[PDB]
Amino acid sequence: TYKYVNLREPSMDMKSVTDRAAQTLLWTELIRGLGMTLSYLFREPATINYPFEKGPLSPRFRGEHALRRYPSGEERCIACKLCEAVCPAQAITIEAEPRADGSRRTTRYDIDMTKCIYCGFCQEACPVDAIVEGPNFEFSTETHEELLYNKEKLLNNGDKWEAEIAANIQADYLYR
Amino acid sequence: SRGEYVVAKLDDLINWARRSSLWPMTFGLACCAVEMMHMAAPRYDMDRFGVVFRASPRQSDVMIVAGTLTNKMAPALRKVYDQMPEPRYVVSMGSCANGGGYYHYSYSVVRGCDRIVPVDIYVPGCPPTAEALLYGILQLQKKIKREKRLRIWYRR
Amino acid sequence: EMVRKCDPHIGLLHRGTEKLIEYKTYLQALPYFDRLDYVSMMCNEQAYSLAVEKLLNIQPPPRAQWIRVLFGEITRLLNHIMAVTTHALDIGAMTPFFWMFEEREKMFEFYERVSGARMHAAYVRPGGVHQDLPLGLMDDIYEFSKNFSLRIDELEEMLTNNRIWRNRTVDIGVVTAEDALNYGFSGVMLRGSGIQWDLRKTQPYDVYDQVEFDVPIGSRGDCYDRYLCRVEEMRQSIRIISQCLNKMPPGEIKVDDAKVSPPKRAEMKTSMESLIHHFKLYTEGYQVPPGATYTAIEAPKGEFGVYLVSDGSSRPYRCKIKAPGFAHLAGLDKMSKGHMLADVVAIIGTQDIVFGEVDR
Amino acid sequence: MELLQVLKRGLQQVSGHGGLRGYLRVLFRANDVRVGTLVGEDKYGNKYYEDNKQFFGRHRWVIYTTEMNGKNTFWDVDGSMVPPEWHRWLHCMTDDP
Amino acid sequence: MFMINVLTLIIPILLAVAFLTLVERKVLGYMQFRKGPNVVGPYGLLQPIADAIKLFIKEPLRPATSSISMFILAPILALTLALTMWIPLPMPYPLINMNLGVLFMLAMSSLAVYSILWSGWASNSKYALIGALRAVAQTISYEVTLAIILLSVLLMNGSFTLSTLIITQEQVWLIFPAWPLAMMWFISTLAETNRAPFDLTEGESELVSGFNVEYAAGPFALFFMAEYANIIMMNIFTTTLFLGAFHNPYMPELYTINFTIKSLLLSITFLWIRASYPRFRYDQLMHLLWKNFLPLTLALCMWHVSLPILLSSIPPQT
Amino acid sequence: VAAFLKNVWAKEPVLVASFAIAGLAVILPTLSPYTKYSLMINRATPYNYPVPLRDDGNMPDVPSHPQDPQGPSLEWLKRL
Amino acid sequence: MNLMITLLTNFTLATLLVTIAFWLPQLNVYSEKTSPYECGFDPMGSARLPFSMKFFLVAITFLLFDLEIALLLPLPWASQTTNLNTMLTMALLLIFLLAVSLAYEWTQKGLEWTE
Amino acid sequence: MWFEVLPGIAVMGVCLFIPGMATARIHRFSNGGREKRVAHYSYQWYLMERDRRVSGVNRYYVSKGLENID
Amino acid sequence: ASATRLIQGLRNWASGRDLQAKLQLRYQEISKRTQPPPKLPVGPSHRLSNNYYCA
Ligand SMILES: CCCCCCCCCCCCCCCCCC(=O)OC[C@H](COP(=O)([O-])OCC[N+](C)(C)C)OC(=O)CCCCCCCCCCCCCCCCC
Ligand SMILES: CCCCCCCCCCCCCCCCCC(=O)OC[C@H](COP(=O)(O)OCCN)OC(=O)CCCCCCCCCCCCCCCCC
Ligand SMILES: CCCCCCCCCCCCCCCCCC(=O)OC[C@H](COP(=O)(O)OCCN)OC(=O)CCCCCCCCCCCCCCCCC
Ligand SMILES: CCCCCCCCCCCCCCCCCC(=O)OC[C@H](COP(=O)(O)OCCN)OC(=O)CCCCCCCCCCCCCCCCC
Ligand code: SF4
Ligand code: SF4
Ligand code: SF4
């Protein structure tokens, strides 16, 4: 159930002593290493041509946040604050009130994308699939406060990426 | 005029020379150093973009703060940044280098390296993918491309 | 250049993880562990999960145990690729770095397909795992593992027989066995010194007593035997991965107590008890019975332990994190007595240190 | 000999991009010369190509448009220019364009 | 018109250095299963121009603590000695035909150490001084065999003349009678030029950048191009020593193309050894060139003294 | 001496090759028939001018023309 | 004459690549960028302290073997002499004396480094 | 694939083919369509200075054969 | 996989192993990106009888 790495005594007949001395004087293993490096020289390299080719992803992928809507236009967030209660970085800040037609909807729904740890607890705690963590990951900013998303930026990410988020959730939701 | 054309083509020349020869310094801090190494890995391969490691700050262009900046290494980050020649740039990688991150309310975390160094590009993620870090580097190259150094100098 | 004293000042990545754990629930404290040993994410998840399940008096299903062992061995391949390739980078051979990070890229794709994030998964949770394996993932794990042996073979072709590599590792950083135990070394830092000890054999957890593998033991306590132990642990990790692919059971992937594991979303949205349990788990969290435990597993750096103190509430009272790298970096002071600056770099290489878990 | 077949494959990649001018176009805009099965095009001009003989990562690419939303993207191509219906297929989230 | 001859020597061997940076990065890329630079030009052919323009428009950064006269005088001497070791090299006719050109090459090999040496000392930093004295610990190891190997290879030539070393190898390559001297000379030229596995001065992982850890861009380019000029010059010198080609006196271009492709194969061999090996500890360097190469080199020196006497094969000095 | 020779070839083969090459270089020029031709070629190479002598009358071996039958000949160099 | 022109040209466009490197870019000098580099933190003491040489006996012996290649160097010329047994004997005696010196420095552990 | 290194090497080869070939041409331009007269030894320099004297135009590469004598 | 048999043979000679049997580049043999919808099994306590929580 155990093995001894490096416990081989070298043979001491004239054949193997001459082989080790030719290895010392004629550098067998150094030519072996050069042969392996030359063997990787003649290969097709694994470099994809980004930004024209994209690395492979799964429909489970956790990128930029987005608030979804029902297939009626009504947004799914009903202000229940499970996503900010489960959020391990406390990046989510929610404040709500009953709106003009008496519905439990949010007024403030902020996700600080510089606190957020992209772990997808908010999308798996959300009981109505409102907040999801979408497939975009190329959303770098030149300014720090552009990564402080309010409700309007999250709703625009939802209305931007819904045609892809709906298909990822459609391919994935049976595992949840 | 003629001189506007001269300084415009010289700006395009020096912006090309500075965006297609970015030499980042070997500077990781935390988990994001692993994904910065994967941005150097043979799949994504920074080196094809002219983006190659130089170990000393004197011989490097952009400082990728990749990881968590604590209170104990904030002056080390600042003196590394100061010992970079101008033009020097900063790419912020990961949530802790952006805004404090997962350790935001900690007693010993500098809440973002924008408190310490001037930051050009913010790359978001915990960690951002190496594809997203390469996106941030290409957006830094786009930011260098539209600089107007000699055009403003000829117009000042 | 003969080194007389090393003083490793650390705390440059100390972020106060285990005080932030005191103010968050157990599910909110789980993604701190991915960020301790940032090349051994699911191993730290598995250690914290075994600690919380030990305090909760519950156990995972069989499939979640085999998933934990399969991805812990994928994690062991990740960590020993990182160890060997950065050690050869620090000695000077920067080539198998690039050769083995393609394989490490493909195992990050396995993490991305199983959990959605490439590095920090938050996947191995107290109660099993979060989400079941997607279809065709095990076939691609097989297609990876069938070919990874030649990658280890060509790494070993480049470095093991090489005389420049043997000149940098063989008389360097010798650790005697009694000073290995008396410094709290663990894992390969014991096994390079010839000590017959491995936590997956002596204190067996989830289904490691049901798999068959061999525990590589060194003979001279140096950097070269620890190198060979890491390479052979990659070999035996491929062996355990083959045994886990062949012997995967069907069934569920969470413990079927819904007062610990969250219920499924297809039955959270239909049942009332399941909605109440979903609510109270993702807001309050499960109450852990009070008491302390020290749960230590064989992370690929060594004994990784969580000393977890619970006080009856849904938050940890205290969570001490024993990392292998802390005691190993304490032993760096002895190991660098009688070497040089070009050997202290190789000793920092042979002590596989990741400073998140060293620093918390 | 198969070396002349390599030179023929090079010449038919030259002839495949619409002549030498289009070959120089895709070379200096892509740093990539290979031809592919033109799967699709969006409402902007992004040409989406397959080649299932290439290895997994080179097998689906996009040649971006030259003018999207009023920006001259002939050289300033951006990875975020892909619309979300093709962002599944390009990032290999699906087999279906 | 001789000034035109000097300029047509020294400008193409700066452009050869420039495109050697591209060749180095792409061959190092494909040997490491990645690609090299291929974005900046057509398959990377314009990357060296950007790498060259970028360094002469970046801030020069003379340090505070530096001895500024020596700090600026060291890369000047580096690039000067990088250029002036090409002038006796027969291509098939050298720029400056010296009777004693081999000892000129050896003396300017010895003088080039003061570039690294005064640069590491003058930039008053600690890693710079460590690299500057590891340059001493490397130079006292390679110079104490670099003379005897080069002495023994000229005992079959007849003189210290590089131009006669083409007439000498008209029948056979000189790597056939002196392949131990050749495979030891090649390692001594590896250790001479601070190329891997003998980097040890610009040691990226022991030191930060070693002797030029303070040299920011502009003064840093004249060590980078000096090192690459030394490797191209040194592979050309090794080609002239051991792999000499056919010289048609009416067609010098046959010899020029032939030793050009041979010296390119030797430079690719430098890049291919750099992409495969770990790096020495610099005592194991000193316990190599003194304890392994020097006794065998003295034995081969006795052999190549006594062997032309033994076989009546003493070469002419004329 | 033989077991020690295999032992030192197993320990320090570089030194065995060094002493072997040095020993051959010492002893083997005393075992060559060609070593005479080395010094003969060296003393048969006319660097300086072969200064003529005044013919007093009695020098039958000193020639009067460079193509005379008498004098030192280098046909052994052409044949070898 | 041509050698001095070549050396002056090489020195000239070595120092013409330095004066277009200092006088071309834009400088922003302040008293932290020109500080000594010691990996982010301050150097504990100056670099002008005695940096002790451990390879010192080998460093002296370099000077006594560097004279040997001032003695052994005319061997391509000294083979052209007409006193060849004596030349061969003195040549192999000088390489043998170098080898006896190296063997004595071997056995007295002088090529080994201190500490 | 690998053959993309073959352009850059070629350019470096061009940059190593330019100097030596050029000086060959230069040694045939300023020396009358022939090689440059090699004076490694002082006797060769005396013959070369004799050629410079007998040429009549103070150039050593101007040759005078049997047409110069009567 | 498109490496010609001269380069393929030189590459196998230089490595010393058979490389086309074990390629580190992935091709058509890997799983489909679009998978069929699954049916995950329920645990042991998904029962309507003899399933009290206290036991
Ligand atoms: C110029 C064109 C190319 C030339 C050929 C070279 C191409 C290949 C290059 C490969 C990459 C090398 C990179 C650097 C490697 C550095 C390490 C290294 O190799 O160190 C040297 C190594 C060092 O070995 P080591 O490191 O194991 O040292 C052993 C030390 N002890 C024992 C104390 C542990 O080998 C040598 O020193 C060998 C030198 C050359 C030997 C030549 C012998 C010729 C034959 C002599 C006669 C033998 C028979 C006896 C007489 C018979 C008479 C009939
Ligand atoms: C009055 C008239 C004179 C006025 C003064 C100007 C003098 C000449 C200055 C040089 C030429 C000016 C133009 C510079 C480039 C401007 C155009 C440009 O930037 O085009 C962009 C394009 C690269 O696009 P990119 O975004 O990188 O592509 C991504 C890949 N999909 O770019 C390209 O495709 C090619 C870019 C080429 C850059 C220039 C070529 C290199 C410089 C050579 C000359 C200078 C150096 C000489 C030698 C010095 C020593 C080495
Ligand atoms: C001994 C041999 C030494 C050889 C050294 C050089 C080796 C490499 C040679 C060059 C190889 C090809 C390089 C091509 C680069 C890309 C050219 C190009 O197309 O640039 C486009 C750029 C922008 O064009 P624009 O009009 O803005 O495009 C918008 C279109 N809607 O437009 C521009 O940037 C403006 C035009 C710039 C053109 C620069 C081309 C390269 C010049 C390199 C200098 C050397 C020239 C030859 C010297 C040796 C021979 C004398
Ligand atoms: C006749 C011609 C002139 C011969 C003398 C001149 C030779 C010139 C060549 C250069 C020699 C320079 C260096 C010589 C050093 C010899 C002493 C030596 O190294 O002894 C120690 C060595 C064992 O090494 P160790 O103790 O381990 O060293 C510490 C590092 N590990 O111990 C050994 O390795 C054993 C050394 C002694 C026995 C060597 C036997 C070699 C036999 C080869 C065939 C015969 C060749 C003829 C020469 C006579 C040999 C006895
Ligand atoms: S992904 Fe995690 S850190 Fe980010 S908002 Fe959601 S719960 Fe919070
Ligand atoms: S996003 Fe979901 S979990 Fe958060 S408050 Fe809205 S409905 Fe509740
Ligand atoms: S932002 Fe997060 S994942 Fe990234 S380095 Fe920081 S702690 Fe690690």
Short mmCIF file of N, CA and C and ligand atoms in Angstrom, two decimals, chain B residues 9, chain D residues 28 72 74-75, chain E residues 15 19 40-42 45-46 49, chain H residues 11 14-15 18, ligand 3:
data_model
loop_
_atom_site.label_atom_id
_atom_site.label_comp_id
_atom_site.label_asym_id
_atom_site.label_seq_id
_atom_site.Cartn_x
_atom_site.Cartn_y
_atom_site.Cartn_z
N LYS B 9 0.18 61.47 -36.69
CA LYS B 9 0.84 60.22 -37.04
C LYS B 9 1.90 59.83 -36.00
N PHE D 28 -4.60 40.41 -41.62
CA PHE D 28 -4.24 41.54 -40.77
C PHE D 28 -5.33 41.90 -39.78
N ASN D 72 -16.27 52.59 -35.86
CA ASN D 72 -15.48 51.99 -36.94
C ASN D 72 -14.65 50.86 -36.34
N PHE D 74 -13.11 48.33 -37.73
CA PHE D 74 -12.30 47.60 -38.69
C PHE D 74 -11.04 47.06 -38.04
N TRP D 75 -10.43 47.84 -37.15
CA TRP D 75 -9.30 47.39 -36.35
C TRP D 75 -9.63 47.24 -34.88
N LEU E 15 19.68 44.84 -36.67
CA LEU E 15 18.39 44.33 -37.12
C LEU E 15 18.28 42.81 -36.95
N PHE E 19 15.17 41.18 -34.91
CA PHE E 19 14.36 40.04 -35.30
C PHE E 19 14.74 38.75 -34.59
N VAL E 40 1.15 41.59 -33.79
CA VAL E 40 1.61 42.95 -34.04
C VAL E 40 1.91 43.17 -35.52
N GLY E 41 2.52 42.19 -36.17
CA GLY E 41 2.68 42.24 -37.60
C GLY E 41 2.08 41.02 -38.25
N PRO E 42 2.42 40.77 -39.51
CA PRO E 42 2.06 39.48 -40.11
C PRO E 42 2.90 38.36 -39.53
N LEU E 45 6.09 39.76 -37.34
CA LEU E 45 7.25 40.40 -37.96
C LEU E 45 7.41 41.88 -37.65
N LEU E 46 6.55 42.49 -36.84
CA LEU E 46 6.66 43.90 -36.50
C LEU E 46 6.72 44.12 -35.00
N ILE E 49 9.89 45.99 -33.74
CA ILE E 49 9.88 47.43 -33.96
C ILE E 49 9.16 48.13 -32.82
N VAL H 11 14.16 36.49 -41.99
CA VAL H 11 14.51 37.91 -41.93
C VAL H 11 15.82 38.09 -41.20
N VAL H 14 18.37 37.05 -43.54
CA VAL H 14 18.63 38.17 -44.43
C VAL H 14 19.53 39.18 -43.74
N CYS H 15 19.26 39.45 -42.46
CA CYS H 15 20.09 40.39 -41.73
C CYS H 15 21.46 39.83 -41.40
N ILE H 18 23.23 40.11 -45.30
CA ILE H 18 23.60 41.44 -45.80
C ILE H 18 25.05 41.82 -45.51
C1 LIG J 3 16.60 43.53 -44.18
C2 LIG J 3 15.10 43.43 -44.12
C3 LIG J 3 14.50 44.21 -42.97
C4 LIG J 3 12.98 44.22 -42.97
C5 LIG J 3 12.36 44.98 -41.81
C6 LIG J 3 10.85 44.94 -41.79
C7 LIG J 3 10.26 43.54 -41.78
C8 LIG J 3 8.74 43.53 -41.85
C9 LIG J 3 8.23 44.26 -43.08
C10 LIG J 3 6.75 44.57 -43.07
C11 LIG J 3 5.82 43.39 -43.19
C12 LIG J 3 4.39 43.82 -43.44
C13 LIG J 3 3.85 44.77 -42.38
C14 LIG J 3 2.42 45.21 -42.60
C15 LIG J 3 1.84 45.95 -41.41
C16 LIG J 3 0.39 46.37 -41.60
C17 LIG J 3 0.21 47.40 -42.70
C18 LIG J 3 -1.17 47.98 -42.73
O1 LIG J 3 -2.05 47.64 -43.47
O2 LIG J 3 -1.31 48.94 -41.81
C19 LIG J 3 -2.61 49.55 -41.69
C20 LIG J 3 -2.47 50.86 -40.97
C21 LIG J 3 -3.79 51.56 -40.85
O3 LIG J 3 -4.33 51.74 -42.17
P1 LIG J 3 -5.71 52.51 -42.38
O4 LIG J 3 -5.69 53.16 -43.71
O5 LIG J 3 -5.94 53.34 -41.17
O6 LIG J 3 -6.80 51.34 -42.37
C22 LIG J 3 -8.22 51.56 -42.19
C23 LIG J 3 -8.91 50.76 -43.25
N1 LIG J 3 -10.37 50.98 -43.23
O7 LIG J 3 -1.62 51.72 -41.79
C24 LIG J 3 -0.45 52.10 -41.27
O8 LIG J 3 -0.03 51.73 -40.21
C25 LIG J 3 0.26 53.06 -42.18
C26 LIG J 3 1.22 52.37 -43.14
C27 LIG J 3 2.41 51.75 -42.43
C28 LIG J 3 3.12 50.69 -43.25
C29 LIG J 3 4.25 50.00 -42.52
C30 LIG J 3 4.74 48.73 -43.19
C31 LIG J 3 5.96 48.13 -42.54
C32 LIG J 3 7.23 48.94 -42.72
C33 LIG J 3 8.44 48.36 -42.01
C34 LIG J 3 9.73 49.12 -42.24
C35 LIG J 3 10.71 48.46 -43.21
C36 LIG J 3 10.38 48.61 -44.69
C37 LIG J 3 11.28 47.79 -45.60
C38 LIG J 3 12.76 47.99 -45.33
C39 LIG J 3 13.69 47.03 -46.07
C40 LIG J 3 13.72 47.21 -47.57
C41 LIG J 3 14.23 48.57 -48.00
#
